[PDB]
């Protein structure tokens, strides 16, 4: 089912590559930087889990 | 690996992007404007 996983694999980069933009911009304008944005703690804690799906699955997948 | 078989451009160029950081510094100076 590597295709099932390959879509989830690319879903890492897609979500990462935006957080690549989002995190700095979150710090760009200090107004409501840490005030308005908890999305880091919302995205990051969800982002780290998107790493574990990679290997542990592929170890069984491939 | 075959499960990873295709990401052509990504695996083609990873290693160039470290250089790009040095370049970014200048652009990040350009807007700041020295």
């Amino acid at each position: 089912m590597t295709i099932l996983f390959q879509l989830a694999l690319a879903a890492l980069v897609i979500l990462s590559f935006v957080m690549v933009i989002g995190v700095p911009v979150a710090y760009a304008s200090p107004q409501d930087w840490d005030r308005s944005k908890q999305l880091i703690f919302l995205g990051s804690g969800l982002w780290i889990a998107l790493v574990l799906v990679v290997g542990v699955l592929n170890f069984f997948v491939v | 690996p075959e499960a990873y078989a295709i990401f052509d451009p990504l695996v083609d160029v990873l290693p160039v992007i470290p250089v790009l950081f040095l370049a970014l510094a200048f652009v990040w100076q350009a807007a700041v404007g020295f």
């Binding site: 700095p24 760009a28 304008s29 200090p30 | 052509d8 370049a23």
Partner: peptide, 29 residues
């Protein structure tokens, strides 16, 4: 190539984009 070339062009253009978005935001630098 071209498909791959397009993939490379698309894959990492966050540099300029990052600055432009930041510039629009007038965040910090």
């Amino acid at each position: 190539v071209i498909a791959q070339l397009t993939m490379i062009a698309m894959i990492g253009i966050a540099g300029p984009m990052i600055i432009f978005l930041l510039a629009v935001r007038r965040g910090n630098l």
